[PDB]
Symmetry: C3
Subunit: 340 residues, 3 copies
Amino acid sequence: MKRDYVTTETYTKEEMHYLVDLSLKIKEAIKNGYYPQLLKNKSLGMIFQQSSTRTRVSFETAMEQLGGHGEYLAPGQIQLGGHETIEDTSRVLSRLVDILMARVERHHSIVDLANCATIPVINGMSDYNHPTQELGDLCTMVEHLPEGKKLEDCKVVFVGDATQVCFSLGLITTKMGMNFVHFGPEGFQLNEEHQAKLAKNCEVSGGSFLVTDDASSVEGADFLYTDVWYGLYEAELSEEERMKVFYPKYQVNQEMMDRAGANCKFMHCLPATRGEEVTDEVIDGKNSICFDEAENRLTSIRGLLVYLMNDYEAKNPYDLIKQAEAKKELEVFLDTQSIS
Amino acid sequence: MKRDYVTTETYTKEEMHYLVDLSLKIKEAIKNGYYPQLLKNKSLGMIFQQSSTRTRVSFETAMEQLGGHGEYLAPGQIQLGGHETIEDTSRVLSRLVDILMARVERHHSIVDLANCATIPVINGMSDYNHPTQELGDLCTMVEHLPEGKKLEDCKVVFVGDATQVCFSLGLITTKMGMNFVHFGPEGFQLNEEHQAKLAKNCEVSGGSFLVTDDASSVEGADFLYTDVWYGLYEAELSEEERMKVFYPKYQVNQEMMDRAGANCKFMHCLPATRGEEVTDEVIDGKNSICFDEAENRLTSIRGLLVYLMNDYEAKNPYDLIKQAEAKKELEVFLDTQSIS
Amino acid sequence: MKRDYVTTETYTKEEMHYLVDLSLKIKEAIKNGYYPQLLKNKSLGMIFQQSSTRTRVSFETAMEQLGGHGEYLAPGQIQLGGHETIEDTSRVLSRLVDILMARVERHHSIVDLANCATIPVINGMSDYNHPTQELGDLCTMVEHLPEGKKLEDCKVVFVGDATQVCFSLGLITTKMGMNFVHFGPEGFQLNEEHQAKLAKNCEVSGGSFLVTDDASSVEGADFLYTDVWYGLYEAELSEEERMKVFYPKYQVNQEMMDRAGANCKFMHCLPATRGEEVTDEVIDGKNSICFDEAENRLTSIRGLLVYLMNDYEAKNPYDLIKQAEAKKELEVFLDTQSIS
Ligand SMILES: NCCCCNC(=O)CP(=O)(O)O
Ligand SMILES: NCCCCNC(=O)CP(=O)(O)O
Ligand SMILES: NCCCCNC(=O)CP(=O)(O)O
Ligand code: NI
């Protein structure tokens, strides 16, 4: 058996809390120069159907820091495509690596990869959701609490397009019992199906959620979060199209931050298109925490990797007697046996 | 000096036997959670001119499991092409990595890479042959013997196109003293030059070989093996073209397996095109061993890497006095010496 | 704080001397089978905007040999481009890897990467200069001194186009107090701005420099060095164009070597276009040292990596008490704490 990390919809608040603390304790070790060798000789397959800097480099660096290795399996480098299905790729990689991740164009790809694999599979972003971004963002908000506020007393407002990150921020904030708002224009708001999933989180958590085009909704935000306006990477809105939909109302400028409140922190998943969703003043300013946020992509990925591999090993333990037998037989062979 | 693994034509039965046992003993160690650090700090260059999932990931995972690292040198990433020849690439990489592999469009490329390199070179597939697939397939057949049969008493029938895998399966089966058949249609059968090389293997080994379009030839097979119908990756047959040549006679369906025999196991090098060469029923069925086969691509590559590097080191031993001298001088330099 | 390696213009002769000795002592260790684990669990980001065999493989192999790992971040794989600026890429990678290198189309890219990063950045070649090639070439000339000559008594003549390598060879040779010549045709010579920088090196070093189209200038060379004629990779001269400019006067043939002197050694940064800049006879001949030169790309990159990371760690030391605290808290968490 195994466990996947495809959506936080399969994780409780208490589980996400553990993942936060695990990630933070690994971070503090590494920040101070102790690299815990928790994944010695382990291999991670990384399937990327789209561009990535933070997610990809976090996975690859994480593996090295923990004593393992990440393999960048790009499109067209591997047989997946015309020559081979997702199902076969999954079943085969299950024999050849210890853990798998993928950034996919369509969510069904990551779901099928997970369902067909006997090893843990992690969603590195889909058109639906972005669960590693959730955990990284949670870690970041935990590290940047307003003085005299608990996490669940905080208000998080996402500004602009209903992207997979928008929705993921909603999923995680409501899961943790926080107050969430999507401030977005008509036609680009979280839809009713998405809102129903947020409602369902709030029934359990005590959190709240609002989807609105009212500019006053940013007032009181502890975290103000934004993303690009060009939509899905395979069918991007042009500069003219997206400016017409979103600008100037949804640009996160200094005026909007101050309307949120003097203490409100700015978050962006990155990459940012400067001068559209956010201005240079905000993103490089005194209240921007998006670079710490970027760091925490690695923070959270180290935690996910360690938890999933530990869970896997506890469910599939090595037989220690057979291990000793196998070590010894190999040693005898190497010492006494020759091709000639 | 060094040794290469370009074709099993340069290896005896007794040598292939050693490579099998080496590979199997490393597998048993790793299966039970002991990772033998046999290639510490060693670097493998991986040149891929074509797509690959099993071969590439096996090489990269193998290096990590054994304490080393594999570098994916893709086409156009490196200077090989307009800017630089195979010969120069080989001579230069010989200075920069410890062992080299390549999947090539044309066999002469891998031969020239081998002849110009002072380090071991492994053929990761060519339009002529596929020697790592041979060793993996041998390991698989050894692990899946029919009850009450020795390896050399087994009958292996390849169905369909005379691909490099078809021929490689012939080379290895005849080398080991087994009985080989290519069941293929006129115009797509192993040619006379290829058959002569099989005949020459059989003179030494006591094995046999047949090339035929007779459907009854599958009867008695212990292993029934197939491959895709679209030919060479740079000039693929279309769906319509290849179906016209091969379908339905050469599709491995449940009817063909049962005609072979109730105990016959199904093998495919993968990737498979489901619904052409083989049906979903066979490939996912009770007698399919192609996923174990896929696993054994890694099994065999770990063995090849270890043998070739051990052979290299025995032929080019480190001077231990110089090693100690060099370690100490470096330590003095690092402790006492400064850029300022 | 940190230090970069973008140009040798920021390094003294005495500093380059240290880098040579460091590199040579690491080489001698590794040549004799001791791999110094000086970069344990460290991650290197490698941004390549252009093709590379020696530079890329040297970086990736170097990291493995020293106990770390190099990540090949290719164009379009990462978000740099339409989606993200160099500045943001730099600031983000500073959080996700420990050291960064890049081969860039335009020099400003590498300068901006360096200025925006809090981690060390290395220039892996630009349209302006090639500083890792300088150090590798210096190491090579030091290892191949003519009997009875000091380094600073040697004459180095570069033949042909005023490439970034031509200029870099000038920078390093003059920095070290050597005698430099560019033998090149009118219109393709080092320009006045470039010559001024060489003059400035010579004022301090006691070296000399000449830029000329006089064929007799090769006479007395201890090292005769050449490069391709097709210019910048994004806008290459055709075969016909470059032959018209350079051939036959600037082809390094056996006649030119013998005119330089019987002892003169031939150098090329590679890759070479055989039959243009240099003939098969010279490059494969008794006086060619370009393959040792190629080896020393790795030699020098190992030294640069170690020096820059050591400098970084001395400027940003780990707190040992916090390190011990963090190790222990993580151990308690892993032993006592559970997601359930
Ligand atoms: N709507 C676009 C969401 C992008 C999220 N960004 C990331 O995950 C960071 P990177 O891995 O793409 O660098
Ligand atoms: N005639 C096509 C033969 C393909 C052989 N297949 C393999 O080696 C597996 P992969 O490395 O291509 O995934
Ligand atoms: N004028 C072209 C200079 C090329 C320099 N060559 C190199 O750095 C070797 P590689 O890293 O391109 O293989
Ligand atoms: Ni790697």
